[PDB]
Design a protein around this ligand. Structure first.
Ligand SMILES: S=C(NCCc1ccccn1)N[C@@H]1C[C@H]2CC[C@@H]1C2
Ligand SMILES: [Cl-]
Ligand SMILES: [Cl-]
Ligand SMILES: [Cl-]
Ligand SMILES: [Cl-]
Ligand SMILES: [Cl-]
Length: 348
């Protein structure tokens, strides 16, 4: 067991191993506080995330377990990777606090795309890395669900990592009105049309790739309905085949109230873009999710000819998510989380 020291950082007590020095607050969502630090063991500038009220309810306790299981599994260049997890507790009986550690990232896609100049070569490399990471995530039957520019970390050399997996956190109010939180969402999940699957992430990659090419948001809707009208104007109103797959009758009833529109010409929307970029956007931005290109199929598209290497696009170990259908008490979720903290093995 390392030695721990205590310090108060913006109204909060932090108890961390001596290896972590020069702690300084970076911010706080509603589910945690984050400090920057120097790790004397690895020599990395690290990002440390402390959880707020991890075991306050059954919902919160299960979310804490879900986040720790997911972060312990992900071992890929283009996805967030765990360096450490710790608790100052010496037993299950006094266990209350969880701390998570990752290699530090100082900016998102918004920081590097708006406030710089992107060649087609930059767009190829950034979208290649997102799809390399997604092939790995999807091979473990994991769905991200919340891909958007603020959840993609990018460094000086244009190297990219996916972070902030959807842990089923987003509220009704967070998705309301003129908000970036909704602009990258597939229409089947925005309006609860049907049981969704991993194809929802490919829709989000299409919206991100269009925005890198034009410098503008693809579907900046003022509300759920305005956004659907923007989507259907580009990709066309649904045919009988997709309408049958919408399980919600009221959702089906509303779509059928809209005047029929054909799919637009993408060469006339994305004026001047590489024709191979236009062709890939047409294969991602398909209304019927059954017919979208997969991450594994997209990596072999001629747009990425420069970067594609089928011997260096790895898949994940199997990931058991049977806990998701399990009904347990707070103290049972807390015991499972404790076991995952003490069994952690750091990377080499
Ligand atoms: S290193 C980082 N997030 C990791 C958070 C985390 C998540 C899990 C465990 C530990 N730390 N985020 C950078 C700060 C903002 C600017 C670029 C991105 C967003
Ligand atoms: Cl230490
Ligand atoms: Cl990482
Ligand atoms: Cl504790
Ligand atoms: Cl964003
Ligand atoms: Cl597993």
């Amino acid at each position: 067991r390392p030695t721990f020291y205590r310090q108060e950082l913006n109204k909060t007590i932090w108890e961390v191993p001596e290896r972590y020095q020069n702690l300084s607050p970076v911010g706080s969502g509603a589910y945690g506080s984050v400090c920057a630090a120097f790790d004397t063991k690895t020599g990395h500038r690290v990002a440390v995330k402390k959880l707020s009220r991890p075991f306050q309810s059954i919902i919160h306790a299960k979310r804490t377990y879900r986040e720790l299981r997911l972060l312990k599994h992900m071992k890929h260049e283009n996805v967030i990777g765990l360096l450490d997890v710790f608790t100052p507790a010496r037993s299950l009986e006094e266990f209350n606090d969880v701390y998570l550690v990752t290699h530090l990232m100082g900016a998102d896609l918004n920081n590097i795309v708006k406030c710089q100049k992107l060649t087609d070569d930059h767009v190829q490399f950034l979208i290649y890395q997102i799809l390399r990471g997604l092939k790995y995530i999807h091979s473990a039957d994991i769905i991200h669900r919340d891909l958007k520019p603020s959840n993609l970390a990018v460094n000086e050399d244009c190297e990219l990592k996916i972070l902030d997996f959807g842990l089923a956190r987003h509220t009704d109010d967070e998705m309301t009105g003129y908000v970036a939180t909704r602009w990258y969402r597939a229409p089947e999940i925005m309006l609860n049309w049907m049981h969704y699957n991993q194809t929802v992430d490919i829709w989000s990659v299409g919206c991100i790739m269009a925005e890198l090419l034009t410098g503008r948001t693809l579907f900046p809707g003022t509300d759920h309905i305005d956004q659907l009208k923007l989507i259907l104007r580009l990709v066309g109103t649904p045919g009988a085949e997709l309408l049958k797959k919408i399980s919600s009758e009221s959702a089906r009833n509303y779509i059928q109230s809209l005047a029929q529109m054909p799919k637009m010409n993408f060469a006339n929307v994305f004026i001047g873009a590489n024709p191979l970029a236009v062709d890939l956007l047409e294969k991602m931005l398909v209304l019927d999710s059954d017919k979208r290109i997969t991450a594994a199929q997209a990596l072999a598209h001629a747009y990425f000819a420069q970067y594609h290497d089928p011997d260096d696009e790895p898949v994940a170990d199997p990931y058991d998510q049977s806990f998701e259908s399990r009904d347990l008490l707070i103290d049972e979720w807390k015991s499972l989380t404790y076991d995952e903290v003490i069994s952690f093995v750091p990377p080499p």
